[model samples]
Target: SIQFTDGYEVKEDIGVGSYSVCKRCIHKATNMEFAVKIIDKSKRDPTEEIEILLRYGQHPNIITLKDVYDDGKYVYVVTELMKGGELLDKILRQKFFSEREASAVLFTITKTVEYLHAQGVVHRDLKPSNILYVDESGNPESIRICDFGFAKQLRAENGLLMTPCYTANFVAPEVLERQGYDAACDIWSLGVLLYTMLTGYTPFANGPDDTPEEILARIGSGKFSLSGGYWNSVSDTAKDLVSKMLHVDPHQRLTAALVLRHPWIVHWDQLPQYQLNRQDAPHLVKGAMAATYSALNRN
Candidate 1:
């Protein structure tokens, strides 16, 4: 009794994960809604995702897997429904996010990563597109880091990962170095996310008409600056947090747990936030951030 043929009507493609195409599913018997991620078995390996899901799926901030079905050619993975779209899409639809709001978002993400680390898992690819919301609340509480395709279990303390998986803009310096790195890589990604949220741009944003290899080189250098038009209004506390997270040396970078207690984020709710006033814009730049994120298949 494979769950794929268990009387569920597959709908349009909601999104795609790294190795799977995520579709909205409706249970024919109960009218219940869910998400079914379809993947071609011959073209991809599902073992790591399977292990990560079964091990880390229990967390509320991570999507819950309800069923799994496999045939010789394809695999079907059904998970809980997340109605809201990608965090990247939300950020793209707006000009910029406030410091307090960005802090709240980072806080939730930090806690989630902290929980994953406690369980010995490292999410190699942490980016805005993978972060999902229950709905378009714009509230930090609704965000959930959803995709786990690049995730892996670190068997030993100080265990290093050499696979070098990552998104273009959010990749850590160590990952690009092709050296063994630990969970601190995720801290670098967090720094990128925070910077992008506040500035409407990534610190290591791809240069105009630059090559992917060039972009990778920039990320590897670990030399991103907080100097831009939008950055002036941002507070020092927030920039300091970003600096700590963006450290090139993964060993010296802040951990997920330490980020939670950081002064900037700890007092996120109390700080007076600053947002870029884009009210004067008569148009919106909505296209595939062709130069930004390497791939579109995340949450």
Candidate 2:
């Protein structure tokens, strides 16, 4: 094995994770530059995000992970650096983004998920923070998938999950019940997530102040509504679209393709007049981002 103590000339730390950091680096030799992501292997066990990045060498919507180098303390993941930021942060900053627009974003995410599924990959955790975007020339560029910590490459049917791994607000009911689940879990998450964008909150939580168990109990109850002060403004088609997603039965829920085909998704004009607590989204987004970073880092 070839190892260089300083393969990348040091630069400022541009970003940080729970146990890792993203730093800009230059090849001391030729002045080439890019960001290098290093996981603190000494602090936690490594998992599939590393494996997927290593094997998934291409995909417009995924982060590149190659040129891995280890120095016993860290595993430096190599990839050319780019811009924008996590989809979570971007959503937080979009003061007036609309439902129709948000639907389009979902459509893009759906497509990306399709590609992953086709390759036998299952992103157990799919939420705003994992979907990254970079604006180009005043237009949104491609949406890339990141944080493959909960990601898995399934080989066949009934790919049942045992070890409970999920984010609270967006987790599927099957997971909370400890019933063991499959790909449909991710699809359900898309529903909870869409509800978040259309409104300012998640579907199953009794209220924002609820405890994690309090929230999970609601999710476990397998009941949610697109009715109330917040959702009254959402269209019937839009509400139904969400209904098809957050179903208790995985088989009863919408698949990725079906979600893309749902009338609310395709009919831009029918988009509900979406509203949210502009003040709260930022906090939640950051929380979601940070929490996932730690959860993933925990191995």
Candidate 3:
């Protein structure tokens, strides 16, 4: 284990986790900025997350792990600093929301997940906060996947993953039922992601106060509507893509690769570019975003 302070100087605290605190740091030599996740070794083991990052962090759409250091009490995991905040935040900030923008975001997300699936890795916990941008750059494709805390590599011999790890609205039916599930769980999440990005509200959630049980029931039933003032203007082709991915049965759900080939994703440029006309659209997004932020922030 190398000394964390010898090579880099820690800066202000950026965020916190149950067992770690994320901080902005700078390389002593190059003076470049980076995010160093300081995990307390005495509190929990970070071996799984650290190993996972080393294995798959090379991808263009994944947060790059630049260095690691352990000094007995804590382990420092340094990664590229993402300045653009979470993907959902960027979506809500947009003056005009449309299928073209949603498609571009989904394309990056789907392709990234496809690559992870190809490598037999299942990111069981994909959500809005975990998807962040590399910089304040306005490029829609600058997003990257973060937080390998719940990620796991699947082995054929291991059969279906049975652990019930998940977040509320983004969880799949199979996951909630404790039935075996695979990477298709990620597809279900992608469906929710697309739904929220376009409409500014999760399909399975009733409101910010919806109990976990309530949300889970909706997800378990896989019953969501595309018949609201917000959804009326959205293209049917886009809705079709959502329906395909949100299928209750993981076996029947669209795979990441298949989602990439969906008409909505393939010809996204030709899709409607009109802004959402509802007065409550931004309010809905802000409300949901606040709910999610608080939910994940809780220990």
- Compare the candidates by lDDT and give the number of the best one: 3
| Candidate 2 lDDT tens digits, 1-299 | 45634666878897786988878887766677766777888776565677767767476667775467777777777675656666655665666766777777777777777666656567877766666664432233456777776777642235432233323224456444332244677788778668777766656543434455555566677788677776776667777888888887877888787887888878877774555433356666455434433433354
Residue 229, model 3, lDDT: 76
lDDT of each: 0.71, 0.66, 0.78
> Which residue runs of candidate 3 sit more than 4 Å off their true CA positions?
156-180, 278-299
**Residue range 1-299, candidate 1, lDDT tens digits:** 55567678888888765667888999888898998878888778887887788877877778888888886688888888888877756765665456777777788888988887776578887866678887777777777778787787643224442222323234345443432355777788788777766666666644445555666677778788775576678788888888899887777788888898789988776766556532222111112134445632233
- In angstroms, how far off is 266's CA in candidate 3? 1.2
lDDT of 3 by residue, 142-233 (tens): 88999987777643233442223323224445434332365777888788788887776777654677665555677788788887777887
Instruction: Provide TM-scores for the models.
Output: 0.81, 0.74, 0.85
User: Distance from true position, residue 272, model 2, in Å?
Assistant: 6.7
What's the CA error at residue 85 for candidate 1, in Å?
0.5
Ranking by TM-score: 3, 1, 2
Candidate 2 — worst ten consecutive residues by lDDT sum? 160-169
* Candidate 1 collision pairs: none
- Reference-based lDDT, residue 165, model 1: 33
Query: Ten residues in a row with the worst lDDT in model 3?
Result: 160-169
Candidate 2, residue 275: how far the Cα is off, in Å: 7.7
